[PDB]
Structures are given as structure tokens and as C-alpha cells.
Amino acid sequence: GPLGSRKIAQMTEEEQFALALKMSEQEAREVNSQEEEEEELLRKAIAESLNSCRPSDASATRS
């Protein structure tokens, strides 16, 4: 193969089962932590939104 690498030998029955378990673990680890953080930010965003009150100046003059 490439770089003269040796081809991969056939996998045993036990190895195949091991791969199945490994794939399952990878699927769980594929979970993005940002999802949990995003949810927390959303909850905080709501409170900030209520405290984001910023009425336009009556004079129309910028601070």
C-alpha cells in the first residue's frame, strides 16, 4: 500500500464485536458540549433581554 505500508489483516469475530462497542462510545463522545453551554446562555439571555431596556433619547441626541 502507500509508503509500502502492510495491508490490514482480516478482523476476527471478537474484534468486530469490539468495534461495535467502540463505535457506540464514539457516538456518545460526539456530543458537543456547546449544546449544554448554549442552553445555559439562552436562559441568561432572557434575563439580560429584560434588563436590556434602552429607550431612545427624547432629544434624539447620542450619548
Side-chain angles (χ1 to χ4, degrees):
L3 306 177
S5 297
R6 182 172 291 175
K7 292 179 177 62
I8 311 306
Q10 301 298 303
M11 42 276 276
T12 64
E13 184 64 21
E14 294 292 346
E15 183 176 2
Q16 188 283 137
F17 187 67
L19 255 66
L21 299 177
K22 184 178 181 180
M23 289 175 179
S24 180
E25 182 62 22
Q26 290 293 304
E27 288 170 344
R29 293 175 64 189
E30 277 282 355
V31 174
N32 60 351
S33 294
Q34 295 297 303
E35 182 178 0
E36 290 290 271
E37 184 180 0
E38 184 178 0
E39 182 177 359
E40 182 176 0
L41 290 169
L42 180 60
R43 180 173 63 84
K44 192 188 287 190
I46 292 169
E48 293 291 338
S49 179
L50 266 291
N51 291 340
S52 69
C53 295
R54 206 290 78 71
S56 177
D57 289 347
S59 70
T61 298
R62 299 277 298 174
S63 317

